[model samples]
Structure formats: C-alpha cells, structure tokens
Target: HWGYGKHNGPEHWHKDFPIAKGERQSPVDIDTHTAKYDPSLKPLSVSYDQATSLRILNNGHSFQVTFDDSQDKAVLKGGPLDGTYRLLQFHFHWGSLDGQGSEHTVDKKKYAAELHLVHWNTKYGDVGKAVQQPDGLAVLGIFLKVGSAKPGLQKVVDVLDSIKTEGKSADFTNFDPRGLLPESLDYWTYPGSLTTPPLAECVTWIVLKEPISVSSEQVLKFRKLNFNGEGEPEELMVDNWRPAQPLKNRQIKASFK
Candidate 1:
C-alpha cells in the first residue's frame, strides 16, 4: 500500500505518516567540515553472539537480516549512546545504477550503497515502546564503496538468488555483523529519524567515516531484488534510499578529525 512509488513516495508520505513532517528526518548530508569534533567521545564497542542472527528475509521493501533481540545477544555501547542498545534488524539501500544509492551523503558525494544496522534502547523495554521516546533508537550507518571484493558480503549476496522476489526468505548463519564494518571506527554522530515513513526522531545516528569495500558486481546483484511482492508487477528495488532531509536546528558531532 505505502510503497516507495511515485504516488506513495517520500514527498506524499506526510499525508499518511504524520511524523514525516517532523524535524530530524534522516539521510542528511554530513558536512564534515562543520561537524564539531568532540574529544570526549568514546570508542565504539559492538558485540554480537554470532548465534543471535535468525533469518534473512525479503520484507517486500528491502531484504533484511533479522535477529532474536529478545535478549542482549548483540549490543552497541559507547560512542554517543547513553545506555546500551540491542540489535534489532539490519537492512540496506542501493541504486539501480552504480555509485549513487547511499542514503546519507558526505561533502555532497553519494556512495554506491549504504548499510544500516538498527538497534533499540533497552531501558524502555522492547523496541515497540522504546520508539515512542526521544532517546530510544540507535542506528549504525556504514557506507559501501565499489572496488575490491568483500568476502563478508558473499553470504548475503549468495542468498540474493533465493530472495529475488518479495516475501521470500531463507535460513542464514555463521556471520558476525562486525565483519561488515570497516577497519576504522572513527565516525560522525548526529540526531536524526528513520529514513522511512513514520519517521521517528529517536535515533542517535552513528555514521562511519570510512566505507567498506564491495565488488561492483555485488552492487549490481542488489538491483536484482524486487520491491513488489509475488503477483505484482516486477518493480525493481533500486534507489530505495530516501533523499536528504532538512537539518533544522540540530548539531552533528564527530568522534575524530
């Protein structure tokens, strides 16, 4: 119903999703030159049990890797977060073409792809209730570059064939989310909303400065995935990223120079 088509796109999302007009919507251009550097920022600590990841699915929007976050199987601490944040699900955004699908831009330059690892605050209990509060969400944004082959992405890419259509899913395992990150943890921090509708202004946006490598071919495989489900016309799921939103009166902090 609320697909990312012309009629239901981000421009018209405010009519249905009230929060669409709210301040702090995501995918903003991180102007690094103006992003104030804070010396007090702590290094990030991300821990995943390896067994927490349950399944990977094509949720008809984009493919996602879901985990059993009922417990603290995976968590993110330090780096602009007040309390520990537990992992929920991780998803990605890319374009139909090459080198221009990233949600957030740096110095106005768009990357080939972007990876979002969603996590929720545990102090408010489950994510359902936590989302309604101000300090309730934390998302790690990792940009993807088109270059050297990434062995870590092989597992996710290997399953793209099985999940070409919408609503398709398959069992997945033996992966650590940490493997997907770049060597440097230096990052830019900000306050923003989910890039999607019902855009909640709860996320403590921790976006990495360095991008991880992925083969150009792997980026093209992402284009094969469909946004429309079975029985619907094959709508290619490329360019699923939302455009940059207004910065409003927010300040972006950086953990490094």
Candidate 2:
C-alpha cells in the first residue's frame, strides 16, 4: 500500500526530497473570472508524429515515455515561447482510493488524474540537467476524467498489459503523443512549484481547461502501479497525487483570445 505517510507525504517531501523543491507545483484553483483573458499565447501550430524512437521506462514513480529528439514533432514552437523544446518524458498523477486525481486544483477541486508532458529547453544542452535549473522546464497539465469510454486514449491503454509487471517497460516505438492533446489548446499560464520532491519553484505551467476522458478500467490499471522502491512486488500506487494548494496571491492567466 502506498500513501503520503509522515515521511512520504507532501509536507515532508520538501525535507526528504530537497532536490525537486524548486520545481513548479500545480493544482491551483483556476479562476477564470478574476482577471482579463488573453489569447496571444495560444499555440500557433501543434503537431504529433508517430515517434520512431520511444523508450518506456518505469523510474520508481510511474511509467514514462522517453523519446529520441531526432524524429518527434512533440516540439513546441512560435509565440512568445521561442527556442526548440523537446518532449523529454510524459507521466501521470492519480488518486489512491478515490477515482479522481490531479496536480492542479480547480477552485480546490481535484480531477481523476493528471498527465504531465515534460519538456526542457534544448538550448541548455541536457534535458535532465536543465530540469534542475530555473526556466529550464515546461510542463503541460491535462486532467483525466473517468467515464463510459474514450477512444482517443485507446492507443495508450492498449499497451498497459505489456507493462503490467513492475519495473517493466517496453520499447514503444512509432508512438505519437499528439493524439493525447485535447482539441482545445487554450490554456492558463502561471508560476508554480513542482509537485514532486524538491518542490522547486521554477517552471512555467500551462494548464489546459479542457479535460480528457479515460475508461474506468484504465484508471484501475493505473492505480496498480507501485510507489515503493522499484523491483518490489506491485503494491498499488493509488492516490499518488498531492492535494491542490492555495494560489497564495498568484495570478493564473490564460492565453490571449
């Protein structure tokens, strides 16, 4: 059984995992009414190509996709967001006992799950090291809801059975993450800390208002992951998400319309 016990919970994360303390955090309530909306930052063009170089890794926390930069169009371009940022990895955050889980809080409400598309500025030279630096990371937050069924996520869920066992991840070649993006690219931008350990204060957050749906069975499969030290028998990593925090006088602005 996994949980945010005294040593593992968010409160202690700052002390136990100081490395990630400066990372941008999420789940702040989305208040669309308080401020004037802007749309200039909306993505000018977004595309996804089936990744030819995909590596599935189980790095203790959850299953993630690491792509080879040479062929993936998961890169972001145009707008005030200049420079080529490569999609380094993608992972999810979910609830343990409850059906809903997410990193960002919408008016203090948490969703069933949250997916983070992690990218780092290529100008920095290394993705892993760049994550440690401020302004080096860019995360796209997508909320996942449980419902009857979602055909859009079929391609991803179909591979669950292959990596069901702990510490097991297949080489997922020819995969494209663009299929997972919701039709609406409009998003809210803000400054926040990382949800993981270290809780770094660096990171530009782009949270999508449009949430995507997933199957109940798929949700169940996700909960089966183990948060315990890797290589141990699967022990259910349910409720892996932290509760949403207060905006703390922070302004969450959306892209220009």
The TM-score values for the models, in the order shown, are 0.97, 0.84
Worst 10 residues of 2 by lDDT: 18-27
lDDT of 1 by residue, 1-257 (tens): 57678888778888888888778888799898899999999999888754377889998878999888888889999998888899988999988767688999999999988999999999999998888988799999999989998898888998899998888998876567877989999999988888886788888899999999999888889998998877898889988889898888888999997
List lDDT for all candidates, in order. 0.87, 0.69
**Candidate 1 minimal-lDDT segment of 10 residues:** 45-54
Predicted structure with the largest lDDT when compared to the true one:
1
Give the alpha carbon lDDT tens digit for every residue of 58-81 in model 2: 555667887776544567654335
Question: Which model scores highest in TM-score?
Answer: 1
RMSD versus native structure for model 2: 3.1
Clashing pairs in 1: none
Query: Which sections of candidate 1 miss by over 4 Å?
Result: 49-51
